[PDB]
Amino acid sequence: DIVLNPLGVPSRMNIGQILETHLGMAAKGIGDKINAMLKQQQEVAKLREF
């Protein structure tokens, strides 16, 4: 969606946005592995483990 400039990380020293990017990559990805088990509609038995 948004194509930012990676030539504003080193010399500007806002660096945890790279870490805000990475933990932001995880949390939406698990939102999609859960949406696997909501469209395919298997059960809630494997969900409670997961």
Binding site: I2, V3, L4
Partner: peptide
């Protein structure tokens, strides 16, 4: 929240 991606783009994000 925006699906973001760090790269230059033809001088559009200068």
């Amino acid at each position: 929240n925006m699906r973001v991606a760090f790269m230059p783009w033809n001088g559009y994000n200068f």
